[PDB]
Amino acid sequence: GMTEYKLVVVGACGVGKSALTIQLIQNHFVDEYDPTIEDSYRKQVVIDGETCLLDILDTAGQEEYSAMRDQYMRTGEGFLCVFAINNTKSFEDIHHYREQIKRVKDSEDVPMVLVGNKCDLPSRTVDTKQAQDLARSYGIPFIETSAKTRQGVDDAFYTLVREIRKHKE
């Protein structure tokens, strides 16, 4: 039976949670995506030779009950924590997101990956070393991505699957 990995993409508004998710799934870059739209996507991929199904929730601004969000929080196995490299505040927000994840799973050891998105942009205010230092502190990988050019998009989600596989075994 095909293994499924339940992934949840989190981070502050505008960092590119949706654009990352839509790029991985539909192979195009979206200029606007309703920041209030929270949806789940599936895709069949092969990762290190294992055919498997990514089940991804793109979190958003939800003042309303989502039965589907409840299930991904309860049963999600890995988190993509996204900030944007031209948004210092979104980088400062990461710690908040990591603490929420630990609380949701009631553990210090939750599979997650730090993603620095929008690295196609020149106006960079969060440098790579800051992000590596934070990732090293958390004990998690750090990947630089561009939802616009596709740089690191497969790598970020695939690295997350690999962290989940290690968590299992």
Ligand X SMILES: Nc1nc2c(ncn2[C@@H]2O[C@H](COP(=O)(O)OP(=O)(O)O)[C@@H](O)[C@H]2O)c(=O)[nH]1
Least distance (Å) from ligand X to the CB of residue 137?
Answer: 23
Pick from 6, 17, 69, 165: which binds ligand X (CB under 6 A)? 17
Q: Is residue 148 involved in binding ligand X (CB under 6 A)?
A: yes
Tell me, rounded to whole angstroms, the distance of Cα 82 from its chain centroid. Answer: 6
Which residues inside 146-165 make contact with ligand 8ZG, applying CB under 6 A?
A: none
Answer whether 160's CB lies under 8 Å from 7's CB.
yes
Using alpha carbons, select from 92, 90, 117, 104 the residue that is nearest to residue 21: 117
Residue number of the CB atom closest to ligand 8ZG:
13
Residue 10 interacting partner from ligand X, ligand 8ZG, Mg ion, none (CB closer than 5 to 8 Å by kind): ligand 8ZG
Q: Is residue 104 involved in binding ligand 8ZG (CB under 6 A)?
A: yes
Cβ-based neighbours of 79, under 8 Å, separated by 6 or more: 7, 8, 9, 10, 97, 101, 110, 111, 112, 113, 160
- Alpha helix locations (H) across 29-152? 67-75, 88-92, 94-105, 128-138
Interrupted backbone of the chain, residues before each interruption (C–N > 2.5 Å): none
Which residues inside 62-101 make contact with Mg ion, applying CB under 5 A?
A: none
SS3 content of the chain, % helix, strand, coil (to 5): 35, 25, 40
Residue number of the CB atom closest to ligand X:
16
Answer whether 62's CB lies under 8 Å from 69's CB.
yes
- x-or-dash pattern for Mg ion, window 12-31, by CB under 5 A? -----xx-------------
Which residue number, 18 or 159, has a Cβ lying nearer to ligand X? 18
Q: Is residue 147 involved in binding ligand X (CB under 6 A)?
A: yes
Which residue number, 19 or 60, has a Cβ lying nearer to ligand 8ZG? 60
> By the criterion CB under 6 A, which residues form the site for ligand 8ZG?
10, 12-13, 17, 35, 59-61, 73, 97, 100-101, 104
